[PDB]
RNA sequence: CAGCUUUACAGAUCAAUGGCGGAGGGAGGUCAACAUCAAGAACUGUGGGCGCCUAUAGAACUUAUAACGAACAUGGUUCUUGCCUUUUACCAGAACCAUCCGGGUGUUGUCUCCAUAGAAACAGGUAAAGCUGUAUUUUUU
């Protein structure tokens, strides 16, 4: 990273955008974060579905912890049917993932839980996203990111268990929390594009002699446009 | 890209008359190739 | 001429002082302290300069904001990318200062930042060259270090003034966080050290000699300094000097208006901590600690000095630094200092005489000046020249001389005692220094060290350049030496150019290096593998990048690095044996004492032999050494008295001399021997250029054989060893000392109030080989290893040379008897004197070997 | 006054409240700083060692960045017989020259 | 304990000259919109105020280098490994562009707190603030 550097200039950020200018945008709800997240879970859950629908209405469906699965008719077609693109996979992955950090701080806001276990769930769910979810399967890009989370954990658990304390019991959730952001900026913006393509689905070496010849032929038409 | 052949185009434009060019000469195949096709063909008649 | 010279006047910073009157005061002599500030490693010097040229300007160009503020230190006199990049100054490039003194006499410095970093001592010795006063600089913590003594030494030969400066007091304040008595204490035993180390005078505050300061948090004092700007005050004009002396030393202050008792009552803090360091605490504990406003009331009450809106918004290192510059002023004191040490001119005649052997000045008729180094200051090859005599003007034709051609100039005009003058030079442009320019000038002034931009085809590394109008003028002339440049070139480098399409260019670069590096001693070798003797590794690596890329520009290969081996025996010589195409000789291992004295008038020569080594009356009367290597050379058979065919000497060392040069075993210098003749046959038909001639090869076998039969060795040198560990890792250090073949702990010196064990020490160079970074590594940051040569201390490689079965491996290193031999091989191979991978060492002549030596 | 504003973006405090605040880090952010435990641990010799294709036994290592071709092919400069195998010159010097 | 400068002042003639300006706010906002981004900055050009300050706009050269951001993810093509044979999707290293994720700086406007004159000095008084001060050979006994 040190090694390469990277350059920015002139911008005009989106979110500042939307609350300006944009209808249906109104603005600044002062949320609880948890129930925010919530909402942001139910709505990904929506927005899957409403894609499916715009594509040819699968067989398949998913949990509310948005892991995709058929419900029956499993045929060769249905399958060519429903093969769809990775990119939405890993949308889908990335939503689970969210669901799974906000349910963690939903279970500690409700009973049944302890606030040290909270931090240890979201510990769990960052430094293993390799356990709890496959977004290694759809984007593997995402590998060398877990990778890294792996390599912190360790480094931390060392850190940690100087001591005699040894086992699951550990929070720390900071470093391996900051490369999954990471790894979502470097996502996002081709996410984003992806999705467009979708809603807008009404809308929109050795060639070179050919091209040549092509466009030669082309400027000689242009030349002459006679009878 | 395609710039080098512009002025070669416009030279044309300028200098050709609808006559020469309704009489430009259908193109005899320079390197006998129907004849050559008719032959290798006519050896490897499969 | 004059459009040039103010354009060249505006792409410079613009000086609180005025650079005219600067210029002026630069005609005057007595006007113009040459200066060249030295010290150890990383002492602070570049940084006290900066200081200084930060005082001088108005604002300074690269100066950026974080500088200012003072995190990073700005190294004003750093310059080179290497140099900025690397940590280390690397370079003489110092710069030209008019400052006020306490009492505002004007008086323009020549400041020259030399490099602390041993493998510079070449810059070192050339700034002593250069400079009439030398600043020492120490650190505080690592204290009078081994280096700081070795300069101190080779500063009384040069000879020049040691004004000291015990930089890096808050690093005792700070980082050992010494009570303020224990800080005092130190300085103390510091002080002590540097008298030791010196011989005649002695050192201490008053008399204004040190200069007590930190450049990081950028203050340097004087007592008087002190005293001037907080207690004037207090006290009237009268008692101020008393009040000065009092100051120092075991002396103590119980409350009187004006007295001041030396000893005693009650509380302790004598008169230094109570009057300077206690307030030093004070300031730096308020500065960090206190509450700002207070502090602020404190130094409107106490020091008449007010802290601005935004200086209270600064962070405490920086704040400190501020509050301290506020405090001691614009750094005059240590200006002061300087003119007290440096006495002038009583000195001045000494070093000179020095440099260029004693005699008498010619003014008006003739100037003459010292080219010094050659340097790069703004890209193009420019000369530091120090004008002795007279002055020199701009585009005036001049003559020059490299200290090669010094010595041979001198037997010249002995002999003389038609015109012929051998090289010249058009001095295209002069000016001053510097750090970031060259201030460009007209004239040149007796006194003033300058940059001259003519000066360089003619002369390599120094020089004597001159301007004589007549015989008298130059019959009364004398010629600079070649500067002594202290530590003496040892570790090898063998370069081959990657792509041999250039050669020519690697040659080009390799001239430049010899030229703008002064300590490199560039041998070109008859199989196309050009050498480099460094100083040592660092210096190197430094040249290569310089050379690989700027001064060349090419992929350039480079041998795992030697070491110049030398040639001396153990025994004495057994048969002195002649030979014939008719002389025959042999030589003594020379004694240890004797050898030291000639590393550091013939009846006076005898008395030295007697003082050294218990010479007797005959061998004083024989003798005829040479070289500075050193050999001696002896006359002493029977019947050479009565001959006048030994009679006649001039001619017949030649021969000794090229043996000297290029020995027997390795074509490798020959060292620590007393040769002895025992017989010279001459004919009877004498034709006498020939015979000389058979003489000058008869010798150098001669000698050879000689050292055969005194059973030959090469002598390695050793790197005399800094090490300034943590105190608990002087085991790891002494492990890995053990580690490697040679090597010894010869002194763990404890420094005085730091955990920092100064654990001298010794090494073979050959087994350096970035010995410095194994010693880092291992003791994890802590105890800057420092190699180095100045002493010329050689030694036995290990074992018996002239073994044919010595050793098992190739690639691998060889054990200590076989290494001996192999050592030895290895560089007869690289000279090209053996033929094959398999070969073997034998001397002719004659008989075969005596018949092996009866057998 | 420690502060900007509720806007959060400059901060600047007084000595005992960081002192404190230093102190309860130390747990934590315990990175030894002396500048030397660092030699051949700067990215500067890390960037050095990528280029020369060498390790430290703690430091990263990578894919060489140049064409590894060797080919030197024994000259009387770099032959076996003429320079001398004293020293092992490991990979740690390498990059610190 | 003396000096002049400034503030509060009392009533003066009131010129008079200077200052003060013929008065336009100061904060801050996870409020925007608009530029312009390593800090330089020499040097030249042109403004506005006195060999020189303050704005700009044009390159030189800097060192950037560690930190516009003590931050680090992602694309795209070209070269090169390597999966290999392929769609992604990639292993891991280059090159050059781009993509987000953040940032200052001023230009402005707007929303929440802190303000608050419409002009004073001359002549020296009162009160405070800011600096300057004991003759016997070289200055004034
Ligand atoms: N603690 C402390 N550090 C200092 C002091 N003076 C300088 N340093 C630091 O130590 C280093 C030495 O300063 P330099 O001026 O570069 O040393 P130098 O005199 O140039 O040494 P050479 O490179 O050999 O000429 C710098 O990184 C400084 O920040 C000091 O008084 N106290």
């Given at each position: 990273?040190?090694?390469?550097?990277?350059?920015?200039?002139?911008?005009?950020?989106?979110?500042?955008?939307?609350?300006?200018?944009?209808?249906?945008?109104?603005?600044?709800?002062?949320?609880?974060?948890?129930?925010?997240?919530?909402?942001?879970?139910?709505?990904?859950?929506?927005?899957?579905?409403?894609?499916?629908?715009?594509?040819?209405?699968?067989?398949?469906?998913?949990?509310?912890?948005?892991?995709?699965?058929?419900?029956?008719?499993?045929?060769?077609?249905?399958?060519?049917?429903?093969?769809?693109?990775?990119?939405?996979?890993?949308?889908?992955?990335?939503?689970?993932?969210?669901?799974?950090?906000?349910?963690?701080?939903?279970?500690?806001?409700?009973?049944?839980?302890?606030?040290?276990?909270?931090?240890?769930?979201?510990?769990?769910?960052?430094?293993?996203?390799?356990?709890?979810?496959?977004?290694?399967?759809?984007?593997?890009?995402?590998?060398?990111?877990?990778?890294?989370?792996?390599?912190?954990?360790?480094?931390?658990?060392?850190?940690?268990?100087?001591?005699?304390?040894?086992?699951?019991?550990?929070?720390?959730?900071?470093?391996?929390?900051?490369?999954?952001?990471?790894?979502?900026?470097?996502?996002?913006?081709?996410?984003?594009?992806?999705?467009?393509?979708?809603?807008?689905?009404?809308?929109?070496?050795?060639?070179?002699?050919?091209?040549?010849?092509?466009?030669?032929?082309?400027?000689?038409?242009?030349?002459?446009?006679?009878? | 890209?395609?710039?080098?052949?512009?002025?070669?185009?416009?030279?044309?434009?300028?200098?050709?008359?609808?006559?020469?060019?309704?009489?430009?000469?259908?193109?005899?195949?320079?390197?006998?190739?129907?004849?050559?096709?008719?032959?290798?063909?006519?050896?490897?008649?499969? | 001429?004059?459009?040039?010279?103010?354009?060249?006047?505006?792409?410079?910073?613009?000086?609180?002082?005025?650079?005219?009157?600067?210029?002026?005061?630069?005609?005057?002599?007595?006007?113009?302290?040459?200066?060249?500030?030295?010290?150890?490693?990383?002492?602070?010097?570049?940084?006290?300069?900066?200081?200084?040229?930060?005082?001088?300007?108005?604002?300074?160009?690269?100066?950026?904001?974080?500088?200012?503020?003072?995190?990073?230190?700005?190294?004003?006199?750093?310059?080179?990318?290497?140099?900025?990049?690397?940590?280390?100054?690397?370079?003489?490039?110092?710069?030209?200062?008019?400052?006020?003194?306490?009492?505002?006499?004007?008086?323009?410095?020549?400041?020259?930042?030399?490099?602390?970093?041993?493998?510079?001592?070449?810059?070192?010795?050339?700034?002593?060259?250069?400079?009439?006063?030398?600043?020492?600089?120490?650190?505080?913590?690592?204290?009078?270090?081994?280096?700081?003594?070795?300069?101190?030494?080779?500063?009384?030969?040069?000879?020049?003034?040691?004004?000291?400066?015990?930089?890096?007091?808050?690093?005792?304040?700070?980082?050992?966080?010494?009570?303020?008595?224990?800080?005092?204490?130190?300085?103390?035993?510091?002080?002590?050290?540097?008298?030791?180390?010196?011989?005649?005078?002695?050192?201490?505050?008053?008399?204004?000699?040190?200069?007590?300061?930190?450049?990081?948090?950028?203050?340097?004092?004087?007592?008087?300094?002190?005293?001037?700007?907080?207690?004037?005050?207090?006290?009237?004009?009268?008692?101020?000097?008393?009040?000065?002396?009092?100051?120092?030393?075991?002396?103590?202050?119980?409350?009187?208006?004006?007295?001041?008792?030396?000893?005693?009552?009650?509380?302790?803090?004598?008169?230094?901590?109570?009057?300077?360091?206690?307030?030093?605490?004070?300031?730096?504990?308020?500065?960090?600690?206190?509450?700002?406003?207070?502090?602020?009331?404190?130094?409107?009450?106490?020091?008449?000095?007010?802290?601005?809106?935004?200086?209270?918004?600064?962070?405490?290192?920086?704040?400190?630094?501020?509050?301290?510059?506020?405090?001691?002023?614009?750094?005059?004191?240590?200006?002061?200092?300087?003119?007290?040490?440096?006495?002038?001119?009583?000195?001045?005649?000494?070093?000179?005489?020095?440099?260029?052997?004693?005699?008498?000045?010619?003014?008006?008729?003739?100037?003459?000046?010292?080219?010094?180094?050659?340097?790069?200051?703004?890209?193009?090859?420019?000369?530091?020249?120090?004008?002795?005599?007279?002055?020199?003007?701009?585009?005036?034709?001049?003559?020059?001389?490299?200290?090669?051609?010094?010595?041979?100039?001198?037997?010249?005009?002995?002999?003389?005692?038609?015109?012929?003058?051998?090289?010249?030079?058009?001095?295209?442009?002069?000016?001053?220094?510097?750090?970031?320019?060259?201030?460009?000038?007209?004239?040149?002034?007796?006194?003033?060290?300058?940059?001259?931009?003519?000066?360089?085809?003619?002369?390599?590394?120094?020089?004597?350049?001159?301007?004589?109008?007549?015989?008298?003028?130059?019959?009364?002339?004398?010629?600079?030496?070649?500067?002594?440049?202290?530590?003496?070139?040892?570790?090898?480098?063998?370069?081959?150019?990657?792509?041999?399409?250039?050669?020519?260019?690697?040659?080009?670069?390799?001239?430049?290096?010899?030229?703008?590096?002064?300590?490199?001693?560039?041998?070109?070798?008859?199989?196309?593998?050009?050498?480099?003797?460094?100083?040592?590794?660092?210096?190197?690596?430094?040249?290569?990048?310089?050379?690989?890329?700027?001064?060349?520009?090419?992929?350039?290969?480079?041998?795992?690095?030697?070491?110049?081996?030398?040639?001396?025996?153990?025994?004495?010589?057994?048969?002195?044996?002649?030979?014939?195409?008719?002389?025959?000789?042999?030589?003594?291992?020379?004694?240890?004492?004797?050898?030291?004295?000639?590393?550091?008038?013939?009846?006076?020569?005898?008395?030295?032999?007697?003082?050294?080594?218990?010479?007797?009356?005959?061998?004083?009367?024989?003798?005829?050494?040479?070289?500075?290597?050193?050999?001696?050379?002896?006359?002493?058979?029977?019947?050479?008295?009565?001959?006048?065919?030994?009679?006649?000497?001039?001619?017949?060392?030649?021969?000794?001399?090229?043996?000297?040069?290029?020995?027997?075993?390795?074509?490798?210098?020959?060292?620590?021997?007393?040769?002895?003749?025992?017989?010279?046959?001459?004919?009877?038909?004498?034709?006498?250029?020939?015979?000389?001639?058979?003489?000058?090869?008869?010798?150098?076998?001669?000698?050879?054989?000689?050292?055969?039969?005194?059973?030959?060795?090469?002598?390695?040198?050793?790197?005399?060893?800094?090490?300034?560990?943590?105190?608990?890792?002087?085991?790891?250090?002494?492990?890995?000392?053990?580690?490697?073949?040679?090597?010894?702990?010869?002194?763990?010196?404890?420094?005085?109030?730091?955990?920092?064990?100064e654990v001298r020490g010794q090494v073979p160079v050959i087994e350096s080989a970035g010995f410095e970074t194994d010693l880092r590594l291992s003791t994890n940051g802590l105890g800057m290893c420092q190699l180095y040569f100045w002493h010329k201390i050689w030694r036995k490689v290990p074992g018996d040379v002239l073994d044919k079965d010595a050793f098992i491996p190739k690639l691998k290193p060889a054990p200590i008897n076989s290494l001996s031999r192999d050592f030895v091989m290895k560089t007869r191979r690289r000279k090209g004197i053996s033929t094959g991978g398999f070969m073997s060492n034998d001397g002719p002549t004659l008989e075969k070997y005596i018949s092996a030596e009866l057998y | 006054k420690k502060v900007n504003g509720t806007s959060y973006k400059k901060w600047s405090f007084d000595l005992p409240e960081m002192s404190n605040l230093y102190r309860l880090?130390?747990?934590?952010?315990?990175?030894?700083?002396?500048?030397?435990?660092?030699?051949?641990?700067?990215?500067?010799?890390?960037?050095?060692?990528?280029?020369?294709?060498?390790?430290?036994?703690?430091?990263?290592?990578?894919?060489?960045?140049?064409?590894?071709?060797?080919?030197?092919?024994?000259?009387?400069?770099?032959?076996?017989?003429?320079?001398?195998?004293?020293?092992?010159?490991?990979?740690?010097?390498?990059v610190a020259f």
């Amino acid at each position: 990273n040190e090694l390469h550097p990277t350059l920015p200039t002139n911008h005009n950020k989106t979110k500042l955008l939307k609350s300006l200018k944009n209808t249906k945008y109104f603005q600044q709800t002062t949320i609880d974060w948890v129930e925010a997240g919530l909402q942001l879970c139910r709505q990904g859950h929506n927005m899957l579905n409403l894609l499916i629908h715009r594509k040819g209405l699968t067989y398949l469906h998913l949990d509310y912890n948005f892991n995709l699965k058929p419900t029956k008719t499993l045929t060769t077609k249905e399958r060519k049917k429903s093969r769809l693109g990775n990119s939405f996979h890993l949308m889908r992955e990335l939503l689970k993932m969210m669901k799974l950090i906000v349910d963690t701080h939903v279970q500690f806001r409700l009973g049944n839980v302890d606030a040290f276990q909270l931090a240890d769930g979201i510990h769990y769910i960052l430094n293993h996203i390799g356990q709890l979810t496959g977004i290694y399967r759809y984007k593997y890009k995402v590998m060398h990111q877990i990778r890294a989370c792996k390599d912190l954990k360790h480094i931390i658990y060392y850190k940690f268990n100087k001591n005699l304390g040894k086992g699951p019991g550990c929070g720390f959730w900071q470093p391996a929390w900051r490369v999954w952001l990471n790894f979502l900026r470097g996502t996002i913006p081709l996410l984003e594009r992806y999705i467009g393509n979708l809603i807008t689905r009404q809308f929109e070496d050795a060639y070179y002699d050919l091209e040549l010849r092509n466009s030669v032929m082309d400027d000689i038409l242009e030349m002459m446009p006679e009878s | 890209g395609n710039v080098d052949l512009n002025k070669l185009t416009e030279e044309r434009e300028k200098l050709l008359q609808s006559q020469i060019d309704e009489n430009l000469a259908q193109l005899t195949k320079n390197a006998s190739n129907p004849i050559q096709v008719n032959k290798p063909n006519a050896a490897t008649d499969a | 001429e004059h459009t040039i010279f103010t354009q060249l006047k505006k792409n410079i910073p613009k000086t609180r002082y005025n650079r005219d009157y600067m210029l002026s005061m630069a005609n005057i002599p007595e006007r113009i302290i040459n200066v060249g500030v030295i010290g150890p490693l990383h002492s602070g010097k570049t940084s006290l300069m900066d200081l200084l040229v930060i005082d001088s300007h108005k604002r300074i160009p690269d100066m950026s904001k974080n500088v200012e503020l003072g995190w990073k230190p700005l190294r004003y006199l750093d310059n080179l990318k290497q140099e900025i990049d690397r940590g280390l100054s690397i370079k003489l490039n110092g710069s030209t200062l008019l400052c006020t003194d306490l009492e505002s006499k004007s008086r323009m410095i020549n400041f020259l930042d030399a490099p602390g970093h041993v493998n510079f001592m070449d810059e070192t010795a050339v700034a002593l060259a250069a400079s009439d006063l030398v600043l020492i600089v120490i650190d505080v913590v690592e204290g009078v270090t081994f280096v700081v003594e070795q300069l101190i030494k080779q500063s009384i030969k040069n000879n020049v003034a040691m004004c000291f400066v015990i930089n890096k007091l808050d690093r005792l304040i700070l980082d050992l966080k010494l009570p303020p008595m224990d800080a005092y204490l130190k300085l103390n035993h510091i002080i002590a050290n540097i008298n030791s180390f010196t011989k005649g005078n002695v050192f201490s505050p008053i008399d204004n000699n040190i200069i007590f300061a930190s450049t990081k948090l950028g203050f340097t004092f004087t007592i008087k300094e002190f005293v001037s700007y907080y207690y004037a005050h207090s006290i009237p004009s009268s008692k101020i000097d008393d009040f000065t002396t009092r100051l120092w030393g075991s002396v103590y202050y119980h409350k009187g208006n004006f007295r001041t008792k030396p000893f005693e009552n009650v509380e302790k803090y004598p008169t230094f901590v109570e009057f300077i360091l206690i307030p030093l605490y004070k300031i730096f504990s308020y500065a960090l600690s206190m509450e700002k406003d207070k502090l602020k009331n404190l130094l409107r009450s106490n020091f008449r000095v007010n802290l601005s809106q935004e200086a209270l918004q600064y962070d405490p290192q920086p704040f400190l630094k501020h509050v301290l510059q506020l405090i001691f002023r614009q750094q005059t004191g240590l200006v002061d200092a300087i003119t007290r040490c440096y006495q002038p001119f009583e000195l001045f005649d000494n070093k000179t005489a020095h440099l260029s052997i004693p005699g008498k000045s010619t003014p008006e008729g003739t100037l003459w000046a010292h080219v010094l180094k050659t340097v790069d200051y703004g890209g193009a090859e420019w000369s530091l020249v120090r004008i002795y005599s007279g002055l020199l003007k701009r585009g005036d034709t001049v003559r020059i001389l490299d200290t090669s051609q010094s010595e041979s100039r001198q037997k010249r005009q002995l002999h003389d005692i038609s015109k012929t003058e051998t090289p010249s030079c058009e001095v295209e442009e002069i000016g001053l220094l510097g750090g970031r320019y060259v201030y460009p000038v007209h004239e040149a002034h007796k006194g003033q060290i300058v940059l001259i931009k003519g000066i360089s085809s003619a002369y390599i590394k120094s020089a004597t350049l001159y301007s004589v109008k007549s015989k008298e003028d130059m019959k009364q002339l004398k010629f600079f030496k070649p500067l002594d440049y202290i530590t003496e070139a040892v570790f090898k480098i063998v370069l081959q150019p990657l792509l041999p399409r250039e050669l020519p260019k690697l040659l080009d670069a390799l001239n430049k290096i010899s030229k703008y590096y002064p300590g490199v001693i560039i041998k070109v070798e008859e199989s196309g593998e050009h050498v480099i003797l460094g100083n040592g590794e660092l210096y190197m690596d430094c040249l290569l990048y310089d050379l690989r890329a700027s001064y060349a520009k090419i992929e350039i290969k480079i041998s795992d690095p030697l070491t110049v081996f030398s040639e001396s025996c153990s025994n004495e010589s057994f048969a002195s044996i002649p030979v014939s195409n008719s002389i025959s000789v042999a030589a003594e291992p020379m004694d240890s004492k004797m050898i030291q004295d000639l590393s550091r008038p013939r009846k006076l020569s005898k008395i030295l032999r007697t003082e050294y080594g218990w010479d007797s009356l005959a061998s004083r009367n024989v003798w005829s050494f040479y070289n500075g290597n050193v050999l001696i050379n002896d006359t002493l058979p029977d019947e050479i008295s009565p001959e006048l065919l030994s009679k006649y000497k001039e001619q017949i060392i030649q021969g000794f001399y090229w043996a000297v040069k290029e020995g027997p075993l390795a074509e490798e210098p020959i060292y620590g021997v007393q040769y002895k003749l025992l017989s010279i046959s001459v004919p009877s038909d004498v034709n006498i250029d020939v015979m000389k001639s058979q003489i000058i090869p008869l010798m150098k076998k001669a000698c050879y054989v000689g050292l055969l039969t005194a059973i030959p060795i090469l002598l390695e040198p050793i790197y005399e060893v800094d090490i300034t560990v943590h105190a608990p890792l002087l085991p790891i250090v002494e492990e890995l000392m053990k580690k490697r073949r040679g090597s010894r702990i010869y002194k763990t010196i404890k420094v005085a109030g730091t955990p920092l064990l100064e654990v001298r020490g010794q090494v073979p160079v050959i087994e350096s080989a970035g010995f410095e970074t194994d010693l880092r590594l291992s003791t994890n940051g802590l105890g800057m290893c420092q190699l180095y040569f100045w002493h010329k201390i050689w030694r036995k490689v290990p074992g018996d040379v002239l073994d044919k079965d010595a050793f098992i491996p190739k690639l691998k290193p060889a054990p200590i008897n076989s290494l001996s031999r192999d050592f030895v091989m290895k560089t007869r191979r690289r000279k090209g004197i053996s033929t094959g991978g398999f070969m073997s060492n034998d001397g002719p002549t004659l008989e075969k070997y005596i018949s092996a030596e009866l057998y | 006054k420690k502060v900007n504003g509720t806007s959060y973006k400059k901060w600047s405090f007084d000595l005992p409240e960081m002192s404190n605040l230093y102190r309860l880090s130390t747990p934590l952010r315990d990175e030894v700083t002396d500048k030397n435990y660092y030699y051949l641990f700067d990215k500067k010799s890390f960037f050095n060692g990528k280029a020369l294709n060498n390790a430290i036994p703690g430091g990263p290592k990578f894919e060489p960045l140049y064409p590894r071709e060797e080919e030197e092919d024994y000259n009387e400069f770099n032959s076996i017989d003429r320079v001398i195998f004293r020293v092992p010159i490991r990979s740690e010097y390498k990059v610190a020259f």
